Amino acid sequence: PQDLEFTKLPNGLVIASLENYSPVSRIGLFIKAGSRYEDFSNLGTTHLLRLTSSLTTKGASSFKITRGIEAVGGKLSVTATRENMAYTVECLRGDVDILMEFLLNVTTAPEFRRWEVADLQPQLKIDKAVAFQNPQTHVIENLHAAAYRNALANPLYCPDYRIGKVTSEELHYFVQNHFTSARMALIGLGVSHPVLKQVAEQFLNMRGGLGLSGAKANYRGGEIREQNGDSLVHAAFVAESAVAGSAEANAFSVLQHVLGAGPHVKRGSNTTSHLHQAVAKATQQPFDVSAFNASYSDSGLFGIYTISQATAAGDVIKAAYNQVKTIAQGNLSNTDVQAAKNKLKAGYLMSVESSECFLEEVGSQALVAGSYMPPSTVLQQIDSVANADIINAAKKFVSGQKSMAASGNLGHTPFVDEL
Amino acid sequence: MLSVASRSGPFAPVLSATSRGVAGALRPLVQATVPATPEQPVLDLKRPFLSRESLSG
Amino acid sequence: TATFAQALQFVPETQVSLLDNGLRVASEQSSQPTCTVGVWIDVGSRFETEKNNGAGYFLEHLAFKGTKNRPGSALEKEVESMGAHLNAYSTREHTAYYIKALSKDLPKAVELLGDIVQNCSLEDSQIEKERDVILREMQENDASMRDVVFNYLHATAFQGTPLAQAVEGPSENVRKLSRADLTEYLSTHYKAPRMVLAAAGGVEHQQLLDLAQKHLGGIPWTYAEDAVPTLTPCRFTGSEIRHRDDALPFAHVAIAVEGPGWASPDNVALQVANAIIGHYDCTYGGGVHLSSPLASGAVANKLCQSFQTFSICYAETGLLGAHFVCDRMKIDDMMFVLQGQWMRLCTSATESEVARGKNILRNALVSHLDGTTPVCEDIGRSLLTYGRRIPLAEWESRIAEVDASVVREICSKYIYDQCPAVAGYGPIEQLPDYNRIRSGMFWLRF
Amino acid sequence: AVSASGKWLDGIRKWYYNAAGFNKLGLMRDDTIYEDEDVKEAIRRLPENLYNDRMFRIKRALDLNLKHQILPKEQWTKYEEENFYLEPYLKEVIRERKEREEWAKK
Amino acid sequence: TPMRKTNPLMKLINHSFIDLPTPSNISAWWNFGSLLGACLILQITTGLFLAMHY
Amino acid sequence: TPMRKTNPLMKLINHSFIDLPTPSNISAWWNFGSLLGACLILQITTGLFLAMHY
Amino acid sequence: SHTDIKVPDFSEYRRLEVLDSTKSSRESSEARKGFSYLVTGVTTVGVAY
Amino acid sequence: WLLAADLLILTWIGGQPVSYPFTIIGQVASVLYFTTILILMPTISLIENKMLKW
Amino acid sequence: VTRFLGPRYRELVKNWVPTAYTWGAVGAVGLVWATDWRLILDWVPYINGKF
Numbered sequence A: 001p002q003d004l005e006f007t008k009l010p011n012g013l014v015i016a017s018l019e020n021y022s023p024v025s026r027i028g029l030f031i032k033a034g035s036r037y038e039d040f041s042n043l044g045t046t047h048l049l050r051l052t053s054s055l056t057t058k059g060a061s062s063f064k065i066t067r068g069i070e071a072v073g074g075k076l077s078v079t080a081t082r083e084n085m086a087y088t089v090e091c092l093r094g095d096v097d098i099l100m101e102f103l104l105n106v107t108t109a110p111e112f113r114r115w116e117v118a119d120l121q122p123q124l125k126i127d128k129a130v131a132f133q134n135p136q137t138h139v140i141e142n143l144h145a146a147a148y149r150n151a152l153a154n155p156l157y158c159p160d161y162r163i164g165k166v167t168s169e170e171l172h173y174f175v176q177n178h179f180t181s182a183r184m185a186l187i188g189l190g191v192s193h194p195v196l197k198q199v200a201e202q203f204l205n206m207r208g209g210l211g212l213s214g215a216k217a218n219y220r221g222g223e224i225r226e227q228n229g230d231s232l233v234h235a236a237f238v239a240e241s242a243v244a245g246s247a248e249a250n251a252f253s254v255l256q257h258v259l260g261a262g263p264h265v266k267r268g269s270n271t272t273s274h275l276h277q278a279v280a281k282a283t284q285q286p287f288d289v290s291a292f293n294a295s296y297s298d299s300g301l302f303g304i305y306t307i308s309q310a311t312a313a314g315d316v317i318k319a320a321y322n323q324v325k326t327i328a329q330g331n332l333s334n335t336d337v338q339a340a341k342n343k344l345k346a347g348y349l350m351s352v353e354s355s356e357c358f359l360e361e362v363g364s365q366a367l368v369a370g371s372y373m374p375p376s377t378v379l380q381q382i383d384s385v386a387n388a389d390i391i392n393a394a395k396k397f398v399s400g401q402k403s404m405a406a407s408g409n410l411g412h413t414p415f416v417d418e419l
Numbered sequence B: 001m002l003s004v005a006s007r008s009g010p011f012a013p014v015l016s017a018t019s020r021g022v023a024g025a026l027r028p029l030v031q032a033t034v035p036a037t038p039e040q041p042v043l044d045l046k047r048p049f050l051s052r053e054s055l056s057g
Numbered sequence C: 001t002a003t004f005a006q007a008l009q010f011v012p013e014t015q016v017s018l019l020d021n022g023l024r025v026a027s028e029q030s031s032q033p034t035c036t037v038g039v040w041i042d043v044g045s046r047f048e049t050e051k052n053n054g055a056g057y058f059l060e061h062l063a064f065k066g067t068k069n070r071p072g073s074a075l076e077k078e079v080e081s082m083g084a085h086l087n088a089y090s091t092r093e094h095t096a097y098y099i100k101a102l103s104k105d106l107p108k109a110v111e112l113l114g115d116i117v118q119n120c121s122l123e124d125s126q127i128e129k130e131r132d133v134i135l136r137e138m139q140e141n142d143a144s145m146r147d148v149v150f151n152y153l154h155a156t157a158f159q160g161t162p163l164a165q166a167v168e169g170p171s172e173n174v175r176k177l178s179r180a181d182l183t184e185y186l187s188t189h190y191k192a193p194r195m196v197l198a199a200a201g202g203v204e205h206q207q208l209l210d211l212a213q214k215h216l217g218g219i220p221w222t223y224a225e226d227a228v229p230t231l232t233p234c235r236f237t238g239s240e241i242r243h244r245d246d247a248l249p250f251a252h253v254a255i256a257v258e259g260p261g262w263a264s265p266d267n268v269a270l271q272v273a274n275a276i277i278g279h280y281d282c283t284y285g286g287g288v289h290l291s292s293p294l295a296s297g298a299v300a301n302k303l304c305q306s307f308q309t310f311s312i313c314y315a316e317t318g319l320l321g322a323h324f325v326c327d328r329m330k331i332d333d334m335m336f337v338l339q340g341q342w343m344r345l346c347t348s349a350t351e352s353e354v355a356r357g358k359n360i361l362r363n364a365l366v367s368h369l370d371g372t373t374p375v376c377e378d379i380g381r382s383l384l385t386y387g388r389r390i391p392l393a394e395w396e397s398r399i400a401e402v403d404a405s406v407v408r409e410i411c412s413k414y415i416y417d418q419c420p421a422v423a424g425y426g427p428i429e430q431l432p433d434y435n436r437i438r439s440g441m442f443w444l445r446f
Numbered sequence D: 001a002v003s004a005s006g007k008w009l010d011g012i013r014k015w016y017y018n019a020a021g022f023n024k025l026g027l028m029r030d031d032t033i034y035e036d037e038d039v040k041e042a043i044r045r046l047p048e049n050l051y052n053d054r055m056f057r058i059k060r061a062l063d064l065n066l067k068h069q070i071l072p073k074e075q076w077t078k079y080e081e082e083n084f085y086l087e088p089y090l091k092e093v094i095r096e097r098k099e100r101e102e103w104a105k106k
Numbered sequence E, F: 001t002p003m004r005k006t007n008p009l010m011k012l013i014n015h016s017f018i019d020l021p022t023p024s025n026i027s028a029w030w031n032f033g034s035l036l037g038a039c040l041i042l043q044i045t046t047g048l049f050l051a052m053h054y
Numbered sequence G: 001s002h003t004d005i006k007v008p009d010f011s012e013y014r015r016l017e018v019l020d021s022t023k024s025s026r027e028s029s030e031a032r033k034g035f036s037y038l039v040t041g042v043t044t045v046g047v048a049y
Numbered sequence H: 001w002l003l004a005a006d007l008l009i010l011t012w013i014g015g016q017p018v019s020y021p022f023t024i025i026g027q028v029a030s031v032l033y034f035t036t037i038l039i040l041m042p043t044i045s046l047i048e049n050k051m052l053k054w
Numbered sequence I: 001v002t003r004f005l006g007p008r009y010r011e012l013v014k015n016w017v018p019t020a021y022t023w024g025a026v027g028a029v030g031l032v033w034a035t036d037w038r039l040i041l042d043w044v045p046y047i048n049g050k051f
């Protein structure tokens, strides 16, 4: 029975807490640093830096970190994305005094002994490969590369030529310039707030304010294609979208959920989605079609993503796209819109409902301004949305310049300009 | 509201020394199975899926 | 300050109740906007005879297709309009349905369950479509490696036992089914007491119960034809299966031994032993000699690529064991470490390792329960398996009792000098012949 | 208690360094040390520039040996000339070993 | 990492005896070969104790 | 592919004798071990003839 | 497929005690193993003598 | 070389008839033979370890 | 040498002592039987092959 105690600090460090009575205390640390802050000079550094979490540091040997975190039975984890980078650790309530001390040692004082780094160099290919076992990723990281001249174009995963050439000095240069305390935000949960006032105060002695903070990520309309032997061609095409905090962004969310962003029924053909009901009457059943919506502080992206038979591809994405065109015509009933708004309310409350993803939420929006936004307020923000705003969003999609990325046989897929 | 949970989109990898990176946001999955052939790539030094954070006796 | 002396106690208890038709309702208020009602039926794949192996699985496929109240398109249109995520799954022992929506939407969901429970439509044409959908789905799951391996593991471990046949059913049998067989399966299996309604989150118990009376009360309770299932304490064979296909990139094998049932204390200690054995993957940066001793063995001269320890307990038996991927040349070495670890726990079990295993076990059992779905499923699975619930305080009160001597006694009891079931999906060839494995189950030094 | 007496400790140490003949072949003290597992681990660490010099100094010493020659008198390593390059690495490896062994007994 | 694979004497014993592949369908006749290997030992040991008096 | 590296007997002669690496700087003392082998070869054959008469 | 396989009956070869698919093998296993270990145990006695 | 000289001492003593001058030198040579290989050597190994600042 | 001292080593040695009683009994009884020691064997209830 408590609202989270959001608080800023003179160091510029942001701090928050939300007391519960579940035995697993679970804290997180959120640096604004991400893959985008890499440039051509030191590209792929973040992908290794996320894996450097267990390396020895000035205050502790790596054996002490691994064996300590395991002997406690808690566990460290390192989430990362094109925007934020997010360290996290889970532990029992009585053990935090140990594990958080590791966290203090991981982010603030991480010496990188070069041989240990060289030992981790080969692993990047393995992690990149198991990451590329998932078909959507391999398209969408190419999609960002096809959609931006600059900052956001940078891959989360290390480029193949950089797998052996990353160096500890580049790691440090990325650390002092981007692990600025002003960028940082700390999010506890079952841990009591005042002891966070202590341990964060331990964080305050390190580091000055303001990071290097470059780039802007300009938009572009270029393609990327792969040409493979796989029968299941799969691809996405994307127009620019305003992001975030605009009613327009909410209009893109409500838009993708009018289009049916995802299934609600297991083992069931999606009867309500316009895209599935267009493509299904267009061709054979084997396919999957849904809207996509990237959302980043400089810019957002929106557009259909598909998986289909290679022969049918040009029949599929020329169909679902037309569905969006129908929305450009103003053809949109209020009812299915209400259903979609309900899909965002229910789906958002679901994604929030888990504690870990909740911590991801609080730690995600802690950086943009830090003023916590309760889910009911978000519901006010979606309820505010009008049908005309949605029509304006689809209109911006249809009228906008488009990029595309594709992977498969590619015999029949249309090129981006014709789309 | 930039979170992948608040706005479904690109995956945010949870890759780490102590845990698998599986998480993210749609990006279509599972739904393709009702339609024929979502064959999925096989054994390119593949990890086991799921990652048993959902342990049971 | 927060502490287990306090924190363990604050998790709310479920309130069990019994309907006159013997259906049991359970609920857990959690001060949550959202809740997930479901029906954890005790029907499983082990209850079918060879004549009708695919019935239950088939039902899961066509459950949402149609119902007497409405065509299935209307059903899905309704669940989707509500923003609800209906979901279902089946198991060798535990079939389950459950819905996923806001508490404000709660009543509207519940009636639907009863519909889905009490009168699914069974159009013959719908069956005709779902047949080829299954036939394609089978080859679609053939791409999987791990599932095929556990399927060999059950088929090996039990053979003639009803438990042994796969939930999916034979590819030949599936086309031989008819609607009358399905309806007979419905009348003979789906009925309370065996039904168990459950919910958690924003649900208030008495609302859920008073609502349950209006829909689930139509379920028959006295047995039709007074039929009674005849369960047996089924046998565990020591056999092995060894499929090949050498062109596959990696060997993929699983080894298993007889385990204490779904209702015994010993399981707890075994879990601790499993916690000692420790999972690993090459993708992890925590490799080298670090982490769990078997996980430490995975990387030194680079042995195991990826693996895990498991204990698939059943009401009658269970399967302790391990599961690992292999390079063709290392399949022997990966074995020699594994069994040795078992042997190492059969004796030489230091207290600190057991303590670390208890800590990992606590963290696992608590971390699993976060969210509404895990606790509903926990209530749903738990009631059927145990009756009652199993409040976490009971679990950690029980885990604290565990000692290194206890782990040695029990691991020596269920692992030492046994006759393991073994499964191996190729390219196996360096995998030791069954005598080498059986010899590898016991030390001569001890 | 060492002080001006520590200047006397050195007089003996220098004498010893001379008595040990390795400098004569141009070996540094560090090149000399026996290779246990711990040393070998220490060697892996050494920066590439440092590592290469060590290889050459050793190769010359072995090469000098078959001939039975002794390096020219100007080219003998001076006592104060020596780097002690291997010490930080060997102490680090030994410290890691002692730490792991300390953890492994408890 | 079994010790047989490490120590060279245990390596050679791991080859010649413990691990070397053989056809499974080998019959009773091949056994005679090994028997010869045995006989020689006897012919030594026994004979060794005849040389002590002869 | 020299004949010595293909023949299973010659491989032993090749590794144990002809091609095993040795330190360059070996002195006179390391000869003695080999001499011992030769001495044994001498202690056998010579002594063997004594056995023909003793 | 991944489910079509099933183990062919081995009842002809099986020990008489464990033939049924009902009784638990956990008690019988000590007897089955105990017989053979008794055999090897006698044989070791003979070889030792 | 002190130990080697001690070995020569043992040989020359063993080449001689029992008498006090021989037996005394035999006592001393034996005890010295063990002390040099047990006590003395490790200690000066340590001293040499410290002369080079290890 | 010094490292082998430690509480878990004590726990381990305590875990392996009975096995040492067993093998010690094996070697002792086996040694007596093989050499047919008169002094130890006579004490036995039945083994009186020696006169």
Ligand SMILES: CCCCCCCCCCCCCCCCC[C@@H](O)O[C@H](CO[C@H](O)CCCCCCCCCCCCCCC)COP(=O)(O)OCC[N+](C)(C)C
Pocket: C344, C348, C445, I012, I013, I016, I017, I019, I020, I023, I024, I027
């Ligand atoms: C007069 C006669 C005196 C002797 C009595 C008879 C002796 C019989 C023969 C003794 C054989 C010893 C049997 C023990 C076999 C175990 C060998 C090995 O496995 O033990 C290892 C170590 O064993 C211990 O070091 C020794 C335990 C037994 C020592 C008992 C000695 C008691 C002697 C007391 C003196 C009394 C007699 C004195 C007479 C002078 C531990 O195994 P491990 O699987 O790796 O451990 C887990 C893995 N770890 C290491 C990574 C954790």
Ligand code: HEM
Pocket: E039, E040, E043, E044, E045, E047, E048, E049, E050, E051, E054
């Ligand atoms: C394959 C190996 C051997 C075979 C086949 C073999 C065979 C024989 C034969 C046929 C005899 C004649 C005895 C008789 O007919 O009465 C004999 C005698 C003898 N053997 Fe061997 N032998 C072998 C090896 C050895 C070895 C290794 C020794 C070592 C000492 C040895 C020592 C003797 C002695 C001393 C005699 C004569 C003493 C006597 O006959 O009383 N033999 N052997």
Ligand code: HEM
Pocket: F040, F043, F044, F045, F047, F048, F050, F051, F052, F054
């Ligand atoms: C390292 C191996 C051997 C050593 C060191 C050795 C040493 C000796 C010695 C010191 C004598 C005493 C001779 C004397 O004092 O006059 C001797 C005698 C003898 N040896 Fe050997 N011997 C070895 C191997 C052999 C072998 C392999 C054989 C036969 C194959 C053999 C056969 C004999 C015989 C027949 C005699 C008696 C002749 C005599 O005493 O003069 N010896 N040996």
